[PDB]
Design a protein around this motif. Structure first.
Motif, PDB file in Angstrom:
ATOM      1  N   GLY A  97       0.806  -1.224   0.000  1.00  0.00           N
ATOM      2  CA  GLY A  97       0.000   0.000   0.000  1.00  0.00           C
ATOM      3  C   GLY A  97       0.832   1.263   0.000  1.00  0.00           C
ATOM      4  O   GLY A  97       2.044   1.237  -0.270  1.00  0.00           O
ATOM      5  N   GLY A  98       0.169   2.366   0.255  1.00  0.00           N
ATOM      6  CA  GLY A  98       0.826   3.672   0.328  1.00  0.00           C
ATOM      7  C   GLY A  98       0.029   4.749  -0.371  1.00  0.00           C
ATOM      8  O   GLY A  98      -0.994   4.459  -1.010  1.00  0.00           O
ATOM      9  N   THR A  99       0.515   5.971  -0.300  1.00  0.00           N
ATOM     10  CA  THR A  99      -0.084   7.132  -0.991  1.00  0.00           C
ATOM     11  C   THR A  99      -0.324   6.794  -2.469  1.00  0.00           C
ATOM     12  O   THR A  99      -1.353   7.203  -3.029  1.00  0.00           O
ATOM     13  CB  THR A  99       0.853   8.345  -0.829  1.00  0.00           C
ATOM     14  OG1 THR A  99       0.932   8.636   0.559  1.00  0.00           O
ATOM     15  CG2 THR A  99       0.361   9.528  -1.610  1.00  0.00           C
ATOM     16  N   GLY A 100       0.562   6.034  -3.086  1.00  0.00           N
ATOM     17  CA  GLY A 100       0.509   5.749  -4.528  1.00  0.00           C
ATOM     18  C   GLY A 100      -0.612   4.801  -4.958  1.00  0.00           C
ATOM     19  O   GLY A 100      -0.779   4.596  -6.155  1.00  0.00           O
TER      20      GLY A 100
ATOM     21  N   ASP B 239      -8.316  13.882   4.559  1.00  0.00           N
ATOM     22  CA  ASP B 239      -8.233  14.352   3.146  1.00  0.00           C
ATOM     23  C   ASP B 239      -7.932  13.162   2.236  1.00  0.00           C
ATOM     24  O   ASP B 239      -8.530  13.066   1.132  1.00  0.00           O
ATOM     25  CB  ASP B 239      -7.156  15.423   2.952  1.00  0.00           C
ATOM     26  CG  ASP B 239      -7.543  16.803   3.459  1.00  0.00           C
ATOM     27  OD1 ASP B 239      -8.743  17.022   3.738  1.00  0.00           O
ATOM     28  OD2 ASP B 239      -6.639  17.651   3.557  1.00  0.00           O
ATOM     29  N   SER B 240      -7.014  12.288   2.653  1.00  0.00           N
ATOM     30  CA  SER B 240      -6.673  11.062   1.889  1.00  0.00           C
ATOM     31  C   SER B 240      -7.928  10.184   1.762  1.00  0.00           C
ATOM     32  O   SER B 240      -8.240   9.712   0.665  1.00  0.00           O
ATOM     33  CB  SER B 240      -5.537  10.326   2.546  1.00  0.00           C
ATOM     34  OG  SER B 240      -5.301   9.109   1.869  1.00  0.00           O
ATOM     35  N   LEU B 241      -8.653   9.985   2.860  1.00  0.00           N
ATOM     36  CA  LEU B 241      -9.863   9.116   2.853  1.00  0.00           C
ATOM     37  C   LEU B 241     -10.900   9.696   1.887  1.00  0.00           C
ATOM     38  O   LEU B 241     -11.499   8.940   1.117  1.00  0.00           O
ATOM     39  CB  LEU B 241     -10.424   8.954   4.268  1.00  0.00           C
ATOM     40  CG  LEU B 241     -11.734   8.182   4.362  1.00  0.00           C
ATOM     41  CD1 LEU B 241     -11.568   6.768   3.835  1.00  0.00           C
ATOM     42  CD2 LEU B 241     -12.224   8.166   5.786  1.00  0.00           C
ATOM     43  N   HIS B 242     -11.124  11.006   1.888  1.00  0.00           N
ATOM     44  CA  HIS B 242     -12.144  11.604   0.985  1.00  0.00           C
ATOM     45  C   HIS B 242     -11.713  11.381  -0.475  1.00  0.00           C
ATOM     46  O   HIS B 242     -12.549  10.940  -1.296  1.00  0.00           O
ATOM     47  CB  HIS B 242     -12.402  13.073   1.349  1.00  0.00           C
ATOM     48  CG  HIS B 242     -13.461  13.709   0.517  1.00  0.00           C
ATOM     49  ND1 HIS B 242     -14.768  13.866   0.962  1.00  0.00           N
ATOM     50  CD2 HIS B 242     -13.415  14.227  -0.731  1.00  0.00           C
ATOM     51  CE1 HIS B 242     -15.476  14.457   0.019  1.00  0.00           C
ATOM     52  NE2 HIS B 242     -14.665  14.694  -1.028  1.00  0.00           N
ATOM     53  N   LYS B 243     -10.443  11.625  -0.806  1.00  0.00           N
ATOM     54  CA  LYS B 243      -9.943  11.446  -2.195  1.00  0.00           C
ATOM     55  C   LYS B 243     -10.073   9.973  -2.592  1.00  0.00           C
ATOM     56  O   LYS B 243     -10.351   9.701  -3.789  1.00  0.00           O
ATOM     57  CB  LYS B 243      -8.497  11.930  -2.343  1.00  0.00           C
ATOM     58  CG  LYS B 243      -8.314  13.445  -2.377  1.00  0.00           C
ATOM     59  CD  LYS B 243      -6.856  13.884  -2.368  1.00  0.00           C
ATOM     60  CE  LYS B 243      -6.651  15.354  -2.679  1.00  0.00           C
ATOM     61  NZ  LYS B 243      -6.613  16.182  -1.449  1.00  0.00           N
ATOM     62  N   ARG B 244      -9.874   9.046  -1.653  1.00  0.00           N
ATOM     63  CA  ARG B 244      -9.947   7.588  -1.941  1.00  0.00           C
ATOM     64  C   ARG B 244     -11.409   7.124  -1.991  1.00  0.00           C
ATOM     65  O   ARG B 244     -11.688   6.182  -2.754  1.00  0.00           O
ATOM     66  CB  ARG B 244      -9.113   6.802  -0.931  1.00  0.00           C
ATOM     67  CG  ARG B 244      -7.620   6.959  -1.143  1.00  0.00           C
ATOM     68  CD  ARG B 244      -6.860   6.259  -0.047  1.00  0.00           C
ATOM     69  NE  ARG B 244      -5.440   6.230  -0.321  1.00  0.00           N
ATOM     70  CZ  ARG B 244      -4.528   5.766   0.521  1.00  0.00           C
ATOM     71  NH1 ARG B 244      -4.884   5.327   1.720  1.00  0.00           N
ATOM     72  NH2 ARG B 244      -3.258   5.738   0.159  1.00  0.00           N
ATOM     73  N   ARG B 245     -12.318   7.742  -1.228  1.00  0.00           N
ATOM     74  CA  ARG B 245     -13.773   7.450  -1.378  1.00  0.00           C
ATOM     75  C   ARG B 245     -14.148   7.706  -2.852  1.00  0.00           C
ATOM     76  O   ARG B 245     -14.904   6.895  -3.424  1.00  0.00           O
ATOM     77  CB  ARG B 245     -14.665   8.279  -0.436  1.00  0.00           C
ATOM     78  CG  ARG B 245     -14.696   7.852   1.031  1.00  0.00           C
ATOM     79  CD  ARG B 245     -15.941   8.276   1.822  1.00  0.00           C
ATOM     80  NE  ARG B 245     -15.820   8.106   3.277  1.00  0.00           N
ATOM     81  CZ  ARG B 245     -15.510   9.061   4.160  1.00  0.00           C
ATOM     82  NH1 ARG B 245     -15.272  10.310   3.770  1.00  0.00           N
ATOM     83  NH2 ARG B 245     -15.445   8.764   5.445  1.00  0.00           N
TER      84      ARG B 245
END
Lengths: 229, 227
Positions: free
Chosen positions: B70-73, B209-215
């Motif tokens: 996993g990761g940001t990528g 912010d990461s969770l919203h972009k990934r939703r």
């Protein structure tokens, strides 16, 4: 930033990469840290597994460090008799906030003269080699003695790095990183210690490591003689 | 006859998701470990650590084990048709299809979690159901030949679980002892269940912010699987 905490890992041929990469990902999670991977020259360095890592700086160009950390691995026997690496470690340790190691990295601190009269740990299989380098050998997974922190074998780097994070910052910051890491370990077996592993498993390992131990004993007593002269 | 183990190594990987399992599995007899990307050469992790891909997709041998870290990528990979096609190609014959942390969201985007029990990082667990998984709050989840590990450091527990499946218990125990993997964490904050409420609040605030972009990415990836 220009005010970043400066953390340096020695990166050497035949390093045990998890000794470096475990702590690296923990400490790189902290606010405004710069992490250096240090060797004789920048460029590729091959770990004992074949994983290729990349040194970011030379000994000469490395800035003064807040934290120096020496990982372990097959490659430690060469480092224990490398005057250039030992000189770098002693220079940086003169002014570092914390002088640190994981696994058999503490034998390199020992060869540099930095364990004399100090509490230390290392990998369980090589723990006997601490006393000849002047250390007080402690069978604990993370050992503090003033600004010296040493971790036990390989995966102890993770426990070591969270301990160091609490010292550099605070308990709340270390706990946040622990939670981001989801570090609530649940090992599928109980063989992580010679005290808990099946006796058969501890025996096969001591059988495997015997040749390395006898070779590192001779290097250790050569290194101890250089501290004595 | 050597067991062929492949990790996908992508820009902005969480390196410990890969390097933890790598050092466990590369310790086993009769294995060859590959670091796979679109081309061999340097790939930079989210921390700035530089790793080195050993093979392209084309030169990768048929894999016994595929492992997605996993990761940001992962957000980019979830909408990368070449990476998803490559994963499906290897998943077809692979003895084991595997991931660590948010790597399971990439398996989900590839369609490989449909109807299967799976886990992921605690902060992104709500994204498994839209990708078709039965979400299980366990640190290592096995469903047939699929094994998923939870967040970042779960990769070490995952890899010892896998080692016992590829070989046996005694082989996994030998590696556990060589790694001195008898953890003694200095705090009890590794789970949202045990961490102080203040620590959970701050971890959830950092991830938001990461969770919203990934939703948003997840629902596009799910809509493609449906169409």
């Amino acid at each position: 930033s220009h005010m970043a905490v400066q953390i340096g890992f020695l990166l050497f041929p035949e390093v045990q990469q998890l000794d470096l990469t475990g702590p690296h990902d923990v400490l790189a999670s902290l606010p405004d840290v710069q992490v250096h991977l240090i060797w004789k020259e920048p460029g590729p360095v091959v770990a004992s597994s074949g994983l290729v890592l990349q040194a970011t700086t030379s000994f000469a160009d490395c800035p003064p460090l807040d934290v120096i950390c020496i990982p372990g691995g097959t490659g430690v026997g060469a480092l224990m008799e490398d005057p250039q690496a030992l000189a770098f470690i002693r220079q940086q340790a003169a002014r570092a906030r914390y002088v640190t190691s994981v696994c058999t990295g503490s034998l390199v601190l020992g060869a540099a003269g930095l364990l004399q009269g100090k509490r230390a740990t290392t990998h369980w299989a090589y723990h006997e080699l601490l006393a000849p380098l002047g250390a007080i050998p402690v069978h604990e997974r993370v050992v503090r003695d003033g600004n010296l922190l040493t971790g036990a074998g390989i995966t102890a780097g993770i426990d070591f790095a969270l301990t160091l994070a609490a010292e550099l910052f605070d308990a709340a910051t270390a706990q946040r990183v622990q939670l981001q890491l989801e570090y609530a370990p649940a090992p599928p077996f109980n063989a992580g210690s010679p005290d808990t592993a099946p006796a058969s498993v501890v025996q096969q390992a001591r059988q495997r490591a015997a040749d390395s131990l006898h070779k590192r004993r001779e290097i250790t007593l050569r290194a101890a003689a250089r501290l004595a002269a």
